[PDB]
């Protein structure tokens, strides 16, 4: 069950109670389709049925050759603001799968696979480098061509096919056509992976025989729609009468640990005169999951997809942070973990729809309200950073933008605090910090207070030094703070 805590002090909330499906790795499978290799159609009848069959044949031919052009080029793909994204690492998503694709070209590797599938589809092949992979043959097109159309390639008259065969071949061959089309516009790498690349029945019957937990098996096969989006299909080869491509599939190595989504919104002062305001916003936005005694961190909402209570994320775009980061939802000033924040001068009305509610930052004359579908507006917001639960609320309107709130259920707790923007002195408070921490702001402050300390102590230190005596052509002596004339004493 999902709960949410809002922190009035840090203009942030946390959505707690989720579960983590974490993509930790890959498993590469080899999908294949058997293809009769036919360069020459010699049948001279003319009967519309023969004609249509020949048309589909040419479609198949051009499909093959298209795919060969695809095979020559080695496949590749490519897969900030108030977010910490810029801190992320950089990785090669399909690197694994591509290594397998290479291994397939190796002379005689194909034949290992063709010889593994004699007595049944879906079987294990170990490759020359001893990386073992599932291989599944999802289409036998060569068989149908043989058992069905063989008159039309090698005979001239060439007995006439019945129209049922025409329909059937169009049906069968279509899959190859679509797989080819996809690989064409996508330069040989597709994600998510199609129903044409793997049928639900095929992908489940793959998952089932992968080397993983029954909890993992159960987890993918419940979530197939997600599994697809985290998978790739890589065009590999077409040779020796088999088209073969690798589908690299996500290995979830961290299942059912706690996860929470941290939400952030502009904090800011209420000073009635404009431009005189100082403003502070936490930059630790996004997903957090317990992983292996640490906490992982997904700064980018694109990395994470939310099915009900499970949060599927990709560790590839993530950082792994020591657990003490959970502090800043309580003591943002706690020194054991230094929390990251941006600072600036620009007070602009913003709002952020959270899991169980909505944060609202209302600054200036902007009108901020929350309304119910029946009762109309049920709350008007003052200037500041506030929050409202999803219970009894439907819409949150801020300025001219009308936000709808998620209606999924859970308990929501408002946690009062004094807005930490108030603890800062406007004069020494830097707004030039784009990417910053709490202590780095403390540091630019300690320097801009320091040069006040030094300049004031220097100005007071020349107090204790004596001015010039008069220029009047008399000699002067020092007596209790002043100059006196020497004449006084003689």
């Amino acid at each position: 069950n999902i709960t949410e805590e809002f922190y009035q002090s840090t203009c942030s909330a946390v959505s707690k109670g989720y579960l983590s499906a974490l993509r930790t790795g890959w498993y590469t499978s080899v999908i294949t389709i058997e293809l009769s290799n036919i360069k020459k159609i010699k049948c001279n009848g003319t009967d519309a049925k023969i004609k249509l069959i020949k048309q589909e044949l040419d479609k198949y031919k051009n499909a093959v050759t298209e795919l060969q052009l695809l095979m020559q080029s080695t496949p590749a793909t490519n897969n900030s603001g108030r977010s910490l994204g810029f801190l992320l690492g950089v990785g090669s998503a399909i690197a694994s799968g591509v290594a397998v694709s290479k291994v397939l070209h190796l002379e005689g590797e194909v034949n290992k696979i063709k010889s593994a599938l004699l007595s049944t589809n879906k079987a294990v092949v170990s490759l020359s480098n001893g990386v073992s992979v599932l291989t599944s043959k999802v289409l036998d097109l060569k068989n149908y061509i043989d058992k069905q159309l063989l008159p039309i390639v090698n005979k001239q008259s060439c007995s006439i096919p019945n129209i049922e065969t025409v329909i059937e071949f169009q049906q069968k061959n279509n899959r190859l056509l679509e797989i080819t089309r996809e690989f064409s516009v996508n330069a040989g790498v597709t994600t998510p992976v199609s129903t044409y690349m793997l049928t639900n029945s095929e992908l489940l019957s793959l998952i089932n025989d992968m080397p993983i937990t029954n909890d993992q098996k159960k987890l993918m096969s419940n979530n197939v729609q997600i599994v697809r989006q985290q998978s790739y299909s890589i065009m590999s080869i077409i040779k020796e009468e088999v088209l073969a491509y690798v589908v690299q599939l996500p290995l979830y190595g961290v299942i059912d640990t706690p996860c929470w989504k941290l939400h952030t919104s502009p904090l800011c002062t209420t000073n009635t005169k404009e431009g005189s305001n100082i403003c502070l916003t936490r930059t630790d936005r996004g997903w957090y999951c317990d992983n292996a005694g640490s906490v992982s961190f997904f700064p980018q909402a694109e990395t994470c997809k939310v099915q009900s209570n499970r949060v599927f994320c990709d560790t590839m775009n993530s950082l792994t942070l020591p657990s003490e980061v959970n502090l800043c939802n309580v003591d943002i000033f706690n020194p054991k973990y230094d929390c990251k924040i941006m600072t600036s001068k620009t007070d602009v009305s913003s709002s952020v729809i959270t899991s169980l509610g909505a944060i609202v930052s209302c600054y200036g004359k902007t009108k901020c309200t929350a309304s119910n579908k029946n009762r109309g507006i049920i709350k008007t917001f003052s200037n500041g950073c506030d929050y409202v639960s999803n219970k009894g609320v439907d819409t949150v309107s801020v300025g001219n933008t009308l936000y709808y709130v998620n209606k999924q259920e859970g308990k929501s707790l408002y946690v009062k605090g004094e807005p930490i923007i108030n603890f800062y002195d406007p004069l020494v408070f830097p707004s030039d910090q784009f990417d910053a921490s709490i202590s780095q702001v403390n540091e630019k402050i300690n320097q801009s207070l320091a040069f006040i300390r030094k300049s004031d102590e220097l100005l007071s230190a020349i107090g204790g030094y004596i001015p010039e005596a008069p220029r009047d052509g008399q000699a002067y002596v020092r007596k209790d703070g002043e100059w006196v004339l020497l004449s006084t004493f003689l």
């Epitope: 007595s119 079987a123 294990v124 025989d209």
Partner: antibody, heavy 124, light 108 residues
Framework: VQLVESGGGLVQPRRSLRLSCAAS????????IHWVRQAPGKGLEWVSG????????GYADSVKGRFTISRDNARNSLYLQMNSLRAEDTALYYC??????????????????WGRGTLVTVSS | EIVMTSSPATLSVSPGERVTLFCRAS??????LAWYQQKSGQAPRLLIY???TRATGIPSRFSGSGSGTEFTLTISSLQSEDFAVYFC?????????FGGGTQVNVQR
């Protein structure tokens, strides 16, 4: 649906014998077929097999270049040939259909159809 | 070739009792595996295939697990005509191999 082995007998060592299998009651071409032998009071040994068009055929390491397996598909027949027949080849020889059709819409697996099997004894 | 290792040698279980037979495989056979029953003096009957799915005709006493190196055949309540020899086979690669077999003898 029947597989009927024929041509086992009593054969002297080092000499040759031919076994045939006639097929009945199912469309023969569509299936790939294996010869599987069983020594007396012993286990099952896969001898060899062919598949739908003598496209791929394969042998046990035990019988290699000694044995040869071809099919007609016309006579709806299967043939295994036994040369330099050694004395441990004696066994009941089974014609066995492989239920995995490759490319029909519903797949089956395993070895579903077995003859009574002939009986080949290599002794002097 | 990968070696099916049948086990136990023999198994003795009294009529109407669960019996369990085991098949280890040299390298991983995944699931492509089958179980055969052979009553003395006749051919194999095919019991299970895909390790998990009983062939048409087989009663629901016979049940199997699998997809790995280690595998299981389970007969729910042994009945008169179930005392026979059982063989496992994988079809993952050629050559098709088998185990040695497990005799189930009626226990006295």
């Amino acid at each position: 649906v029947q597989l009927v082995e024929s041509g086992g007998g009593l054969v002297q060592p080092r000499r040759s014998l031919r076994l045939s299998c006639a097929a009945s009651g199912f469309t023969f071409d569509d299936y790939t077929i294996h010869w599987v032998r069983q020594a007396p009071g012993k286990g099952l040994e896969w001898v060899s097999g062919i598949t739908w068009n003598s496209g791929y055929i394969g042998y046990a390491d035990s019988v290699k270049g000694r044995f040869t397996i071809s099919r007609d598909n016309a006579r709806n027949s299967l043939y295994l040939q036994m040369n330099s027949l050694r004395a441990e080849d004696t066994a009941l020889y089974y014609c066995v259909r492989d239920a995995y059709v490759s490319g029909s819409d519903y797949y089956y697996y395993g070895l579903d159809v077995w003859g009574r099997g002939t009986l080949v004894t290599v002794s002097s | 070739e990968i070696v099916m290792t049948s086990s136990p040698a023999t198994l003795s279980v009294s009529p109407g009792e669960r019996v369990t037979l085991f098949c280890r495989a040299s390298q991983s056979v995944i699931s492509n595996l089958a179980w055969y029953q052979q009553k003395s003096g006749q051919a194999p009957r095919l019991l299970i295939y895909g390790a998990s799915t009983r062939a048409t005709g087989i009663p629901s006493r016979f049940s199997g697990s699998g997809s790995g190196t280690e595998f299981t055949l389970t007969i729910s309540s042994l009945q008169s005509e179930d005392f026979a020899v059982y063989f496992c086979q994988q079809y993952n690669n050629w050559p098709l191999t088998f185990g040695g077999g497990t005799q189930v003898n009626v226990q006295r």
